[PDB]
């Protein structure tokens, strides 16, 4: 009678290390993550900067870069 | 039928806290039917959940005006009723837990622990000491407070200074619950300023001018003053004055305990110094003392570590070192085993939070 | 290329008890067959962790120095440990109003 | 990079279905498709690169010891670094950099003591 | 106050005093105990002395002091040295707590003792003083004749004799109460002791005692059969069938078996069953004919199979990757399981004329996984497309033998030689990508049929393969072994496979070995515990992942915490991206019958760091919650199905399918959503192919065998193991070499149905039931507490949460002899009036007689 | 006292789940660190 409480006492305890562990865990595990996803950006030759010179209705606008010469490129479907 | 009996439990717990001093007429002339309401093992009744409703404070009150010779008033010389009570307390202790139910558990062994420095001894004292460590976390800031107050008593009879300063400083620390700005936070005051006198001398009475009443502060600064000048004359005076203090508190002993760092402080007071010292001049220092016994009480000095001094009484010449330069004495080690303790303990319970 | 192909005091010191117990055992044998400096440098030198007792003085004065660093560090973890005490119970407290 | 062309009769014997590399292959007959980059190499390779990268074991003594030697300087950049950080943090009033800050002294100190 | 006089007096030095002192102390220990522990010494002197006369009486102060301080087996030493003094049908709270103090010592002395001989209980040879207190404490309880407490500590303290002898005196035949204690002690053996060998010994006593008693519950005397799996324990049973006769009986009993049992097992059940000459009725049942027949007939009109929604799917992709062609030949069998209609494929033929050769093969295989559920009608279906006929390619005619051995496994007495005929001949060819794809379906087919009995004779036909080495077929061959050897497996057989996975130069069959190696080592637990050393020993990925599967296997049904603590380890402290995945897909064979805490281990590690072990987790659920529909599952595949990485969303798919069979909107709101999102993923062509291949199947899943078939790792039947649906999930939940062997769900299919059985007719009745399950919060898809009444028919779809609530009707034209039981499993019949029909209809086996 | 023993059996799977979040985190800090050194 008196080792059924024990055992109920030892179970309480051990889900609240559980949650402390858990919530640490977490923290840790986001800082790889975020390292990861950073690694993919610091892989790039960059993005060139250009003036929009017009828009073509077809879906190409001319553009003049500065770091090379003019082209005509295809427009964003972001923008 | 269930909800009807923790209700019943209420209504006893309720008509027992009012009918005492708290919220009703004078506590001794009450005191039987608060008794009554104890007693038939309706107490024991109450165990739907632990004793955190009724609190180790109020069965203190009760009990004290019962018996203690001084509010019994003789009434009987016997300590049957707090025999029977502690017992009582003791069975408790067994079916409780400590894991997550010690809001009972702290409680009894504070009310058991009250009663042997009451009346009892230190021999005892032990079992108590080491049966008592449980979380602080259960239980309240008034009552963190009082088995703090309690265990520093205890620890000063050992004449543990250092645990008790620590307890002490921590149980009287904020206020947001009442018995840490009223007649509670005095008692704990007058018992810190005591240990601090124990360990050299305290010597800061700033944060006591606001949180005791003047007829405390006066008694304060006397003390303060003698051990400070080194003088036995006016400390024994101060003993004698506040006598009714002295008394008040139940320890007479103490003023036995600190006569003897008196006359400790005032051979400190005047350093070991150059490299042979003059009999005469240590003789007029020993001679305020006790003017008769200077060959005596330098001898007791020394093997004491009041002083460390090389001696001739073939030549009647004192040798001695100055010391004022600290090297390493295991120093940089003791910083780091202390910091990694310190970022562990702090650190694990702050992360529970 | 050798890295994406692939992607302490202690065992110096047995290494160092092996060689001692290996030239030992030459000895030995290389009296038995029969029938300097550098051995010379390898005993009184050392006879004084062992070689660090007489640099511990120098040591120690810097080694309180780099302890009271530890000691600032453990503080500013209690700071960053507050917030997080803070963050817990501000959540708390909505899911009350709430 | 490693690529090869494509057989027919092959890669689409193997890997609706596939109908664009069907058409592709009935086509061209050839085009480039690119093939994976793996390694493989024994045991024996594994374990004795690792005591290479005799030099490493002796080269840690004597990195030990001339550390100790340089410490005067090491010491006294971790003080400003400290003096940086403090400032710091009552501007926000940077967390962050502060506890991997924290993090990188206690390091520093675990090899000092090690040292010596 | 002090105990200081009472102390003082004990010192005077004599026998009056001594006696004195006890008397006193025995009141007031437990308060002044603090005092009293200084003069513990003379009471122990006292104790085994004698020059006084207070002994009993200084053992019981001395039990009491050490009490007090903390010290509670030193204390009990002492209390038991008391003796007369020290009585347990007494009680005080101090009693109470040393007589479980008493225990807990007397648990861990048996623990040793019985691993140490397994007759330690049939003397005492432990401590005469525990032992009675042990009998007497077991008395107590059970003179206050509450069993169930009596019972659980005679468990705990490791002795067989006490549960006997408990159980025994009070069996007074109430009936009731008799059999509801023994059936209560059986499921508790089972669940909570994976100490194997007094398990097994509680389990065989349990069932003799039950068995002898004039009444007896013969659903849970099958359970422990099973459990034994012993051919000897259904013979004694069985002569107590023929005592009592009657067909009715007899036959369910058979209708149980014949699903729960292995092949060898059967085997023996029909040899015993011809020399005992006890019912032609039953040898034919346990030939396996009568059930699947019965499911045929359900399934062919309670079907709701749309083409529509294949042709939907199919437009909705675009091929450009074989992936998609296996999707919807998978999700076409699956959805048109067992209702043996080809219909998709009938009705689409150029795409199939497209198909690369895998693509064939398992188009071929497909009408294998329709076509399962005939014995008969199985072999006569593929026979136009076999090899040495028409077909159009050789690895058409491949698929024809792999759709086969789908079919005929759990019976693949005449299968296994048939296609041995077909390995041995066609070891010769390997010269063409044509013969490669034939042998390649001869291995897998051979391997299915001949499952669950060990035939040496197909083991060394599919080695052979290995030794000329080709490519393809070599994969087949190796897995082969693996399925045929399960669980009966030589020592030799591990030892030969071990050695030649390291040989084997070529990757797929260095694959398939260790795969193979994993199957051969099921239901072994601690005795598998050297191969998996083994395995984890070699030092090759293949291997290391092979390991894992090892333990799932061997541990399954009842967890037990070493076993998860090894592949927690592996998962955790092992890097490596094949075995990382692998032992979390092994939790959940482990956990199968433990499934509510599947969520909380996995739920880290589902939020945990590297795509293959999400994997792995969406996995673990999917096998181990399967046909219970488990909310907590769900709530962790959800993230999941939406997951950057593909095979992640796949698996998810794959997963939450298997859990929510047969279960429908307004029973749960959310699979509206899920069953809209498996239908966007194949639309968009912003998914990539192993998403949609997650996606295409899933639907697969849900729409199963008509919508009447839910995926379980057992009977309701008996609710005792079904071996064949593990297995077929483990070689489900690879795909990654393993392209075509999506058709092992085939095998693990169970129907959900509640259909009575006439005892003589053998048919179906169509008459109203009662319910009280709410229907239209059940409702057809696509294309919560009750007790209110309710209506259901018979041949129509009975859900799992439905199965619990209906009745029999029993004032028709029948008696239903032993009733329903309140889980899913059929009850035969036996008819008051079998000449007239209330409404039944003709079974397939009465279609093809 | 049968009780005790389903009790016990949620209670070992939770300490075992905890001892290996704890190892988890280790493999983490070690991890960390390489990726600080590749970067």
Known sequence: EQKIQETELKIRSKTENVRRLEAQRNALNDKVRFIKDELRLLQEPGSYVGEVIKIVSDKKVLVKVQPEGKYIVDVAKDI | KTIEVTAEINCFMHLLVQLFLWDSKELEQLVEFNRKVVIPNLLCYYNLRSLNLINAKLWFYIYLSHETLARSSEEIN????????????????????????????????????????????????????????????????????????????????????????????????????????????????????????????????????????????????????????????????????????????????????????????????????????????????????????????????????????????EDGFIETTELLNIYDSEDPQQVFDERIKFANQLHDEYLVS | GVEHLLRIRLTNQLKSLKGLQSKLKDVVEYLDKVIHTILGKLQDVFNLNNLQKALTVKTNDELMVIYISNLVRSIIAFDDLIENKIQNKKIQEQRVKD | DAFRLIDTGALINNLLNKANIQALIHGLNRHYYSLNIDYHKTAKETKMLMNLHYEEKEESNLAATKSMVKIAEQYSKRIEEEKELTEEELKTRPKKHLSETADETLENNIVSVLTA | TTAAPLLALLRENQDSVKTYALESINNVVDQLWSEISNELPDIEALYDDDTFSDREMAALIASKVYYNLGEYESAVKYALAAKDRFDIDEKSQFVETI??????????????????????????????????????????????????????????????????????????????????????????????????????????????????????????????????????????LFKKLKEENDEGLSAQIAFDLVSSASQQLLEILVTELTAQGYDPALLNILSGLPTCDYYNTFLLNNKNIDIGLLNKSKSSLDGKFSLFHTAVSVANGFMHAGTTDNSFIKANLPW??????????????????????????????????????????????????????????????????????????????????????????????????????????????????????????????????????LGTGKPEAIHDMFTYSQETQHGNITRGLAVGLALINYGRQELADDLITKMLASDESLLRYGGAFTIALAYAGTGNNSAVKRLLHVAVSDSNDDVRRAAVIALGFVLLRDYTTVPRIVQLLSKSHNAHVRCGTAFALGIACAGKGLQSAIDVLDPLTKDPVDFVRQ??????????????????????????????????????????????????????????????????????????????????????????????????????????????????????????????????????????????????????????????????????????????GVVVLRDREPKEPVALIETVRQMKD | YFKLKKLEKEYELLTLQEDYIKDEQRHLKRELKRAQEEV
């Open chain 2, 78 to 313: 016997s300590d049957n009723q707090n025999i029977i009570l502690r017992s009582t307390m003791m069975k408790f202790l067994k079916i409780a837990s400590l894991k997550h139910d010690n809001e009972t558990k702290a409680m009894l062994i504070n009310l058991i622990l009250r009663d042997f420095l009451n009346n009892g001894e230190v021999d005892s004292a032990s079992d108590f000491i080491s049966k008592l460590e449980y979380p602080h976390t259960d239980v309240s800031s008034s009552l963190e407070a009082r088995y703090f107050f309690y265990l520093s008593k205890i620890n000063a009879i050992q004449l543990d200074y250092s645990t008790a300063n620590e307890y002490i400083i921590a149980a009287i620390r904020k206020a947001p619950h009442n018995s840490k700005s009223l007649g509670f936070l005095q008692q704990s005051n007058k018992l810190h300023c005591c240990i601090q006198l124990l360990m050299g001398d305290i010597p800061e009475l700033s944060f006591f001018h606001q949180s005791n009443m003047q007829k405390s502060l006066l008694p304060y600064y006397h003390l303060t003053k003698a051990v400070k000048l080194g003088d036995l004359k006016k400390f024994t005076s101060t003993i004698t004055k506040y006598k009714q203090l002295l008394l008040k508190d139940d320890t007479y002993q103490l003023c036995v305990r600190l006569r003897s760092n008196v006359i400790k402080t005032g051979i400190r007071i005047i350093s070991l110094t150059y490299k042979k010292i003059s009999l005469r001049d240590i003789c007029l220092k020993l001679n305020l003392d006790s003017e008769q016994t200077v060959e005596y009480m330098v001898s007791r000095a020394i093997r004491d570590g009041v002083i460390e001094a090389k001696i001739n009484h």
């Open chain 5, 651 to 824: 698996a998810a798919m794959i997963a939450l399918s298997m859990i929510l069979i047969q279960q429908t909107e307004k029973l749960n709101p959310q699979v509206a959503d899920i069953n809209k999102n498996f239908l966007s993923v194949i639309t968009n062509k912003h998914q990539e192919g192993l998403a949609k291949f997650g996606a295409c199947v899933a639907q697969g899943i849900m729409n199963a065998g008509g919508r009447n078939v839910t995926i379980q790792l057992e009977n309701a039947d008996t609710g005792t193991l079904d071996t064949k649906s593990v297995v077929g999930l483990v070689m489900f939940s690879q795909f990654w070499y393993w392209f075509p062997l999506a058709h092992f769900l085939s095998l693990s299919f169970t129907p959900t149905t509640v259909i009575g059985i006439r005892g003589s007719d053998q048919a179906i009745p169509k008459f109203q039931m009662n319910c009280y399950a709410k229907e239209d919060a059940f409702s057809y898809p696509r294309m919560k507490y009750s007790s209110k009444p309710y209506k259901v028919d018979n041949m129509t779809r009975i859900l799992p949460q439905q199965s619990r609530y209906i009745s029999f009707i029993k004032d028709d034209r029948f008696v239903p002899v032993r009733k329903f039981k309140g889980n899913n």
């Open chain 5, 352 to 485: 199939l004329g497209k198909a690369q050769n895998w693509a064939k093969f398992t188009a071929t295989a497909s009408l294998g996984v329709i076509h399962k559920g005939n014995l008969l009608e199985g072999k006569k279906v593929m026979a136009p497309y076999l090899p040495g006929s028409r077909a159009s390619s050789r690895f058409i005619k491949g698929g024809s033998l792999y759709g086969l051995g789908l079919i005929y496994a759990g019976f693949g007495r005449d299968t296994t030689d048939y296609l041995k005929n077909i390995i041995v001949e066609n070891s010769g060819t390997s010269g063409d990508e044509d013969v490669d794809v034939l042998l390649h379906g001869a291995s897998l087919g051979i391997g299915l049929a001949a499952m669950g009995s060990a035939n040496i004779e197909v083991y060394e036909a599919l080695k052979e393969v290995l030794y000329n080495d080709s490519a393809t077929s070599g994969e087949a061959a190796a897995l082969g072994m693996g399925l045929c050897m």
């Open chain 5, 99 to 236: 007589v479980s103090k008493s225990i807990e010592m007397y648990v861990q002395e048996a623990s040793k003792q019985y691993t140490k001989d397994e007759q330690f209980y049939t003397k005492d040879i432990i401590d005469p003083k525990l032992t009675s207190i042990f009998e007497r404490m077991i008395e107590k309880c059970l003179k206050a004749s509450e069993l169930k407490l009596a019972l659980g500590i005679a468990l705990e303290g490791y002795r067989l004799d006490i549960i006997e002898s408990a159980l025994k005196s009070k069996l007074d035949q109430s009936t009731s109460e008799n059999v509801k204690i023994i059936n209560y002690l059986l499921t508790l053996a089972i669940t909570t002791v994976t100490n194997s060998k007094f398990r097994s010994s509680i389990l065989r006593k349990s069932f003799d005692f039950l068995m002898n008693m004039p009444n007896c519950d013969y659903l849970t005397l099958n359970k422990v059969v099973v459990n034994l799996n012993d051919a000897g324990l259904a013979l004694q």
